[PDB]
Enzyme design. Structure first.
Site, PDB file in Angstrom:
ATOM      1  N   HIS A  16       0.870  -1.154   0.000  1.00 29.45           N
ATOM      2  CA  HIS A  16       0.000   0.000   0.000  1.00 29.45           C
ATOM      3  C   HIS A  16       0.915   1.214   0.000  1.00 29.45           C
ATOM      4  O   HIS A  16       2.094   1.131   0.378  1.00 29.45           O
ATOM      5  CB  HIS A  16      -0.878   0.019   1.255  1.00 29.45           C
ATOM      6  CG  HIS A  16      -2.000  -0.973   1.230  1.00 29.45           C
ATOM      7  ND1 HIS A  16      -2.314  -1.770   2.312  1.00 29.45           N
ATOM      8  CD2 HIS A  16      -2.912  -1.269   0.273  1.00 29.45           C
ATOM      9  CE1 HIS A  16      -3.367  -2.509   2.023  1.00 29.45           C
ATOM     10  NE2 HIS A  16      -3.751  -2.224   0.790  1.00 29.45           N
ATOM     11  N   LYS A  60      -3.806  -0.263  -8.171  1.00 31.16           N
ATOM     12  CA  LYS A  60      -4.944   0.640  -8.254  1.00 31.16           C
ATOM     13  C   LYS A  60      -4.722   1.920  -7.460  1.00 31.16           C
ATOM     14  O   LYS A  60      -3.904   1.962  -6.541  1.00 31.16           O
ATOM     15  CB  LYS A  60      -6.214  -0.069  -7.771  1.00 31.16           C
ATOM     16  CG  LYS A  60      -6.131  -0.578  -6.357  1.00 31.16           C
ATOM     17  CD  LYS A  60      -7.406  -1.303  -5.974  1.00 31.16           C
ATOM     18  CE  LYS A  60      -7.322  -1.887  -4.564  1.00 31.16           C
ATOM     19  NZ  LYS A  60      -8.521  -2.724  -4.268  1.00 31.16           N
TER      20      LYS A  60
END
Length: 208
Positions: A78, A108
């Site tokens: 992340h 993403k």
């Protein structure tokens, strides 16, 4: 028999082979969209398919790389930045994220408009990077692990060189002292679950 077992068994071997490898380089891409353009994509940028569907808060990017033959082992990263600097962070990382040499085929980015519409708390993880072994047999090669580690670290410093303000790491993730935006999580596996990750062989190979 699994990806993680091969890691445990070649733990030191992979670590020694990796530290002996020369810096890997990533030819960043320029013909890429800026954040605003991404918010408003179905389109394609340098191999990656871009998707924004509404039942989500993300804009997805996936490249059908016919080489990553391994199967997903739950490893992902992340990137956490101040919600307000998502567009600045994305632009800064676009060259790498869309690089032909990037080891990450699927990732993403949070779409700020959908984040508002769906009243989603955006304190961290505006970016998610998916990773899976390169070998058809699902074992991470030392050369691949090294490139992935080099890639992640390239992300880290590109962000700080751009004075990007750090976000808040998701409580379900772990990260070394030296990772200001990047954090790790393995979805196939409380603060008890965090120390579990900290001793994860994949995580340690990206850290020590």
């Amino acid at each position: 028999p699994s990806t993680n077992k091969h890691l445990k068994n070649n733990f030191n071997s992979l670590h020694n082979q990796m530290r002996k490898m020369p810096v890997s380089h990533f030819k960043e891409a320029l013909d890429v969209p800026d954040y605003s353009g991404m918010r408003q994509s179905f389109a394609m940028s340098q191999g990656f398919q871009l998707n924004n569907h509404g039942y989500d808060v993300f804009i997805h990017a996936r490249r059908e790389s016919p080489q990553s033959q391994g199967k997903f082992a739950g490893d992902k990263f992340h990137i956490s930045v101040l919600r307000d600097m998502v567009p600045q962070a994305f632009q800064a990382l676009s060259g790498l994220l869309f690089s032909e040499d990037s080891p990450v085929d699927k990732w993403k980015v949070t779409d700020m408009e959908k984040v508002v519409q769906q009243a989603r708390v955006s304190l961290g993880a505006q970016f998610t990077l998916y990773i899976k072994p390169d070998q058809e047999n699902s074992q991470y090669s030392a050369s691949f692990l090294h490139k992935t580690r080099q890639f992640i670290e390239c992300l880290e410093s590109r962000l700080s060189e751009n004075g990007v303000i750090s976000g808040q790491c998701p409580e379900s993730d772990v990260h070394p002292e030296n990772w200001k935006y990047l954090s790790y999580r393995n979805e196939l596996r409380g603060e008890m679950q965090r120390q579990a990750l900290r001793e994860e062989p994949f995580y340690r190979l990206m850290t020590e």
